[PDB]
Amino acid sequence: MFYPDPFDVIIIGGGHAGTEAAMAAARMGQQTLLLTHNIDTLGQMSCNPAIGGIGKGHLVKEVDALGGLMAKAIDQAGIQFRILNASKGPAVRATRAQADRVLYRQAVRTALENQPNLMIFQQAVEDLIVENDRVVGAVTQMGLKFRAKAVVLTVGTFLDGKIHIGLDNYSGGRAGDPPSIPLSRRLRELPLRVGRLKTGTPPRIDARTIDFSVLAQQHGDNPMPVFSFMGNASQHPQQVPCYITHTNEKTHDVIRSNLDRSPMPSIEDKVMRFADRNQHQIFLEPEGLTSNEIYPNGISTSLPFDVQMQIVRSMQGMENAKIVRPGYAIEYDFFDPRDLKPTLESKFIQGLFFAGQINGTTGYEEAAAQGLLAGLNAARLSADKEGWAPARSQAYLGVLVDDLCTLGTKEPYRMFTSRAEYRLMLREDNADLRLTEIGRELGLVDDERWARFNEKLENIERERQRLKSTWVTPSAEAAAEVNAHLTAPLSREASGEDLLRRPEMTYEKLTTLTPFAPALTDEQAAEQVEIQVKYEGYIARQQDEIEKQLRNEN
Amino acid sequence: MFYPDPFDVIIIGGGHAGTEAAMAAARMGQQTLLLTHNIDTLGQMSCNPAIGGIGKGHLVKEVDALGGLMAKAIDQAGIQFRILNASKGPAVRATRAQADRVLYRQAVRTALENQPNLMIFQQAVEDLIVENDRVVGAVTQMGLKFRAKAVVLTVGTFLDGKIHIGLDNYSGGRAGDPPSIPLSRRLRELPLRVGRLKTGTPPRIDARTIDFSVLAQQHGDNPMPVFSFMGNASQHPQQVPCYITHTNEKTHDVIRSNLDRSPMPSIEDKVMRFADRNQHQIFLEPEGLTSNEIYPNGISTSLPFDVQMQIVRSMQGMENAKIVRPGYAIEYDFFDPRDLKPTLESKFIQGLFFAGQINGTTGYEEAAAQGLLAGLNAARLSADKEGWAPARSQAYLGVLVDDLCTLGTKEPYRMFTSRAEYRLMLREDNADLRLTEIGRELGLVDDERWARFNEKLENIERERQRLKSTWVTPSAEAAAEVNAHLTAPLSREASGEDLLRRPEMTYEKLTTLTPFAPALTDEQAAEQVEIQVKYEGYIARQQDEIEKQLRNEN
Ligand SMILES: *[C@]12=NC3=[C]C([C])=C([C])[C]=C3N([C][C]([O])[C]([O])[C]([O])[C]OP([O])(=O)OP([O])(=O)O[C][C]3O[C](N4[C]=NC5=C4N=[C]N=C5[N])[C]([O])[C]3[O])C1=NC(=O)[N]C2=O
Ligand SMILES: Cc1cc2nc3c(=O)[nH]c(=O)nc-3n(C[C@H](O)[C@H](O)[C@H](O)COP(=O)(O)OP(=O)(O)OC[C@H]3O[C@@H](n4cnc5c(N)ncnc54)[C@H](O)[C@@H]3O)c2cc1C
Known part of the structure; x- marks a missing residue:
């Protein structure tokens, strides 16, 4: 059976890419449908509760300059703001912010709800329906199919994976979530190249069992920076500092002795590669203003639970620390970006776009930028107009897109400043000057x-x-x-x-x-x-x- | 492998029953471990964003009097407060509150986070470990086992089920959630009687596509009532009214014609049973202060999606209404309460308790009361003391427990005022007078x-x-x-x-x-x-x- 109304742009998934794609397509003026398997999960920061930094603040600023949502949301959900490379030249200066998870998730959901021209449906999509190389629509689980002219695909097979913890493993896209086995297998049935990657996350620490009286603190700048050009400082909620501890030689000994247990970035690899170094730096970052969890940055591994407990207790100040959620590593698939045109469209299938994590991109920001571009181009294809793909001399999104499409990648791709061939003119402060006008020529800018x-x-x-x-x-x-x-x-x-x-x-x-x-x-x-x-x-x-x-x- | 520390009370699940059990056991003064498979889902209302009413306000007031959490949480997350049977006698009047979902979930989570003696760990439990009829501990998924003296079981096989929508179905505990197949099968391996039940929920309506200018409103009382004896009125957030519409003869015709498609409370059964009646009453209830969803009360069914769309559009004011989440019906298992002693302990297995939905009871409040009793008794068994089970002449919890254990039930059990043999003295206003002292004799009261x-x-x-x-x-x-x-x-x-x-x-x-x-x-x-x-x-x-x-x- 078919849903009575016909839709123009269909955004599958609900990631950060899906958020940007839906906002862009709807804002342009087309009728948009966002399909997601869980609405309450909209706008969820999977692992690192941080936005911005070196090579990623530029992407957020560009998305804001085109009319995206990430910058405003992070302003509303940011608790500590710092400026990296503040002393050095403007071409290298960047912004970073520690994000409250709950506030950010609420801001994203509320922003999505009120968007005109947008319909959100909570049902898992199991298949794509095509007619002679042109995608016509999507097929959900209960048997209801939706029809549209342009389809943006986000997480078709990214969710087909397995969580690996120590010697054990079990299928799952993330901590306690179902896999997208049907869609992933269906897409695999299509003739495209596929690669496998893995990502690991560290445990969360109960905040009450850690002693903060013996650790140094890092606090945000003053006055606080603001991401979006429209926003101001007062929007930011109350600010909290992060704490710093240092790994000991005992933890190095533990990792060296127990690396044999690992099935094999990661802490164990970091210690093995740099044997000369004797100590590291670890940042304890709050996960919210109303949460008792601490995220330790820089102790990642797939080590079994007892090893993780030893490692975290060996560090200074965490003798009595307790782990609320274990660390873990998860596999997932993706499709090589060498088959996509500069506008992200797939040459193999007409009307089909790929965005976000399905292109071997980790960070939130790169996924969001890919999503904005792919959604914009799918909407333009809907109205039978020319697509728009930035030049490498235009903005960092251009460089990322061109490298993804042409050079390819055998592993996750991370944006860097040095990769930009035009670094002295691609500055955050002027990002809007390089995009806003063009955005207004596409209707994105209100x-x-x-x-x-x-x-x-x-x-x-x-x-x-x-x-x-x-x-x-x-x-x-x-x-x-x-x-x-x-x-x-x-x-x-x-x-x-x-x-x-x-x-x-x-x-x-x-x-x-x-x-x-x-x-x-x-x-x-x-x-x-x-x-x-x-x-x-x-x-x-x-x-x-x-x-x-x-x-x-x- | 075994977690280094030994725990006394182990609560499994994270529902309302698990919440009450953990809070009670920890309050008493024992070392409690609450196991769950998703911390972000703690305190989630799954069917009706309402707490209280006839036969259920008494249970909430009793839990508050003993030292529970539901009353304070609802005071902090309730948006409309009404008093049912206000004109009639005090022995029959009751309280009801339409409650925001997000605020309630936040309040529950924050309350559990700051509980002394309580450790919350997020990982699905797959098995129970016993030694000669005494349960010794629980077994998680990654291979880490926890040991304790008393175990309270909440959702062992409740999550083993299938969602039924129209002709289609797929395994799932609720909307887009994994099933507890391992634990349910494991428990089935044990020698106990099991029954099967089904529950249905109606679709959610986009708030923007409904016209509220042609409908009547119902607003809360003044001054606002307060659930807990300690709380006052000012805690309540801003209040929102509900709207009322009436089903038409056209919708009755639709249901009569299309009842054949149903695989078979429900709307279709309600229409079939009462053919004389020509119109019903439907209440549109907000799902939050920051959500665009409307819950329609009284249109439940398992009808396929197109039929549901017809039914909701046929009603007055909802010609253009759109459905964000479809309605659906889910199966689940449970174990007959005839094998449990008056304290809820299982005779077949020593040290094992059953609480909440696994005993057939549906509503939030009855599950919470069962959980409080079972957790209290498991903690008392931990310290080698006498258990406490109320008498039918003591409080409504006593009547519910005795009927569950003795009479049994072949279907979900719903508390009613008429079931109470002592109705003129079992009044909400004096609930605390009948329990607080005894609570202080158990240490629950602070x-x-x-x-x-x-x-x-x-x-x-x-x-x-x-x-x-x-x-x-x-x-x-x-x-x-x-x-x-x-x-x-x-x-x-x-x-x-x-x-x-x-x-x-x-x-x-x-x-x-x-x-x-x-x-x-x-x-x-x-x-x-x-x-x-x-x-x-x-x-x-x-x-x-x-x-x-x-x-x-x-
Ligand atoms: C329902 N319709 C409906 C209609 C009416 C009129 C009433 C009165 C009630 C319903 N319900 C039941 C209602 O939802 C009920 O009050 C409540 O939502 C369910 O009971 P509760 O509070 O105890 O929550 P739940 O589901 O049991 O949470 C369990 C919890 O356990 C955790 N966990 C951890 N490890 C686990 C595990 N669960 C399972 N297995 C394992 N291994 C989970 O995280 C859970 O959070 C209606 N219910 C319904 O589903 N549909 C309707 O239409
Ligand atoms: C330093 C670093 C470390 C990182 N570590 C980790 C890590 O340890 N673990 C990890 O998982 N990530 C990790 N990431 C990735 C990070 O989480 C990403 O930025 C982001 O969380 C995932 O990409 P996304 O924004 O597109 O969200 P997504 O995960 O891709 O969200 C996809 C959405 O699609 C929706 N959806 C709807 N229908 C379907 C369907 N049929 N199938 C699938 N999804 C469907 C889902 O609800 C889901 O919310 C790391 C990134 C960095 C930079």
């Missing part, structure tokens, strides 16, 4: 975001124009104060743009100086103008490099 | 509850003594005002107790009268004193009946 972006652009342009017009002469009285804040006194009249390019000074002092005061009321605009001017020489050299490379690129 | 109870008893006794001492004479000036509020003028000096026994007057007017003013500052004490005096004649007659019946009872 009115408030567009108005804010246009105001930002106008302020940047006006401030730059005034800077170029401004002229400062050494003969002025303030020149003395200018000479106070200059390595050498002025010899001839200098413009604002010329003066600010000096590596020994920044826009702060110019704002302090009467001629260059006052400053832009918009902090992001002021930072962008400072980057353009102070880094005007380096930015110009990089622009020359970009032009030279794009000559062959174009 | 210090704050005991102090409040003692203050309540002292106030009741003092007010009663003053009432008996008080004498009112017709010769006083206020007697005129007394004659104002009396059917007949006073002929001789009358005491407070004598005057208040008049069916034509209540303690309110006595408080208004100068001699009987002021009133007790404690509302519960004032109500209890009014019940004792005004119903002094009826209560005395019932006390005589109780004594006569207990002569044979003792």
Whole structure:
């Protein structure tokens, strides 16, 4: 039997990719159906309760710039915010946040519920229905089939796996969840390449059995950074610090002695590879404001339960620690990204897209970006329009997509800054400047975001124009104060743009100086103008490099 | 392998029964292990987001009086509060609350997290380990066994079942959950009688596709009632009303025509049994303050999906309604309560208890009460002390337990007021008076509850003594005002107790009268004193009946 209404875009799964795909397709204006086997599980961070960092904050910022949901959700569910590489240059600076699991899950679900044009159905999909190489719809478990023009596939066989703990194992997608054996087998029936990977997670520690009085703390920055360009600081809930402990030589001895038990990143591999090192660093991270669990970062393994208990008790401050949920390793399948076009569409089957974990990607953020691109392109194919795949010179999503499609991967792929060929211009602060307009050309950007972006652009342009017009002469009285804040006194009249390019000074002092005061009321605009001017020489050299490379690129 | 530490009480499952059992055993002061297969699912309402009513508010109040958790949790997660049978006599009135699902789940989880002496471990248990008829411990899935003296079993084979939807079916304990096939089969391997039952639930409706402008509303009372004796009104979150619609003759025609498709309480059975009736009543109940789902009460069936869609669209105001989660019926097993002693212990296996859904009882409250009793008795057996089982003349839990153990049941058992042999004294307002002291004799009652109870008893006794001492004479000036509020003028000096026994007057007017003013500052004490005096004649007659019946009872 067929559901009475016809749908245009069908998003299977409910991961992070499914969330982004549904939001994008519905926001564009098409009729969308999201199929999931458990609604209460929507927006669940499987293992690491953290978002952002080096090579992943850029993806989140791009998704936000196109109109995604991850940045706003994390602002609403973030408890500690830090800036990595804060001292170093902006091209490398990044943001990271520790995420409360409950708050994040509620924010995602509430955001999905209120989306117009979106219908969510809680039923497991067992098959795909196709007619002469064009996918027509999906088939659920109870026998009800849905029809649509474009289908985005998320977790077809990712959930076909087995949890491995020590010598034992049992089929399961995650901690106590059913496998997607039907869909995985069905997809395997199709002619595509398949590879196998494994992922391991460490145990959770009861918070009450650990002594925090003997450990050092790390706290967030001040003032707190905000991910999305629209959001501000006050949205963030109350903040909690993380604690730091160090593995002992006794734990090294335990791992060395007991590695034979392992069936074989992981703690045991980390110790084996680096025998010279004698101690590590471990971060205890809260799993919520209303939870008594501690996530230890950096003790991963597949060691049996008793070994894990020994290892965690051997560490400082965790003599009496108790484990609420054991660590474990899980297998899963995926399909090689070498068969997907630059828009993520499958060449073997028409109308079919692959996104997220099914493309051998671990992190939450990379899965979300893949999902946004695949959902956007499936919706565009629905309305019979051209697809849009970013260029490697456009944004980090472009680099990730191109590498996934062409180079391939025999293992999980992790984004890195060094992989980006255009690193000095691909900066988080300007991510929106590189995508918002194009987003508005696809309809993803709504009115408030567009108005804010246009105001930002106008302020940047006006401030730059005034800077170029401004002229400062050494003969002025303030020149003395200018000479106070200059390595050498002025010899001839200098413009604002010329003066600010000096590596020994920044826009702060110019704002302090009467001629260059006052400053832009918009902090992001002021930072962008400072980057353009102070880094005007380096930015110009990089622009020359970009032009030279794009000559062959174009 | 064996977990290093030895535990005394082991609760299996994580339902409402398991929640109560763990809380009671830990409160007593023993080392408790609660085993479950998903911590995120703790305290989940599976069928109806409602707690209380007729024959079930009494159980919740008894659990609260003993020192349970359901009353406080519901006060913290309830959105609409009503009093059923408010106009009628106190021995029949009851409380009901429509409760948010998310808030309730959070409250239960946080309450279990901070319980001293309690260790929660998340891993499915596959077997029981026994040594010459005495259960020694439990066996999980990964191969780690736990040892203890008393074991309370909750869902050993309840989760062994199949969801039936229309013609199709598939194994599952609930919507998208794994079955407990291993434990159920293992228990079946034991020599006990087993029966099969089935339960059905209706679909959830998207809230955005229903028109609430054409429906009547029902709102809670004012001031709001509070379940627990310790709690007050302000704890309750913001309140939402329910909406009412009525099934049409068209839906009756649909059910009559399509009942053949059903594989066969249920809507179809309700229509078939009462052919004379032409219309029903349906209540649309919110599933949370932050959810877009509507639970329709009274359209249950196992009808296939298209039939359910027709039925829900035929009803008034739901022409365009859409279904997020389909309705369905699930099978499950259970063991006849005729093999359990009055304390719930199994005669076939020593040290083994059965509680909750495994005893046939369906509702949340009956399962919770069974769990409290079974956990208390398992803890007492752990410390080698005498078990405690209530008498049918003591509290509704006593009646439920005795009927379950003695009479038996071939189907789910639902508590009713009429089943209670002592209905005029088994009143909710005095439930604590009948249990708190005994609870303190078992240690379940902590210090704050005991102090409040003692203050309540002292106030009741003092007010009663003053009432008996008080004498009112017709010769006083206020007697005129007394004659104002009396059917007949006073002929001789009358005491407070004598005057208040008049069916034509209540303690309110006595408080208004100068001699009987002021009133007790404690509302519960004032109500209890009014019940004792005004119903002094009826209560005395019932006390005589109780004594006569207990002569044979003792
Ligand atoms: C139902 N309809 C319906 C209708 C009406 C009018 C009433 C009064 C009741 C129902 N119910 C029953 C209702 O849901 C009931 O009150 C309650 O939800 C079920 O009992 P409860 O509270 O004890 O929860 P449950 O399901 O038993 O949780 C068990 C728990 O045990 C854990 N666990 C751990 N290891 C396990 C295991 N379970 C099983 N095996 C193993 N190895 C689990 O984590 C569980 O959380 C209706 N019920 C229904 O299912 N459908 C209806 O339509
Ligand atoms: C350092 C690091 C460590 C990591 N460690 C782990 C680890 O130890 N263990 C681990 O599991 N992951 C691990 N990950 C991956 C991480 O969990 C991912 O970011 C994310 O949790 C999984 O991808 P996803 O966002 O797409 O969610 P998904 O898991 O892919 O969610 C898929 C959704 O599809 C829905 N669905 C609906 N119908 C079906 C169906 N028929 N079949 C399947 N699903 C269906 C499901 O409800 C499910 O919620 C790690 C990542 C990093 C960076």
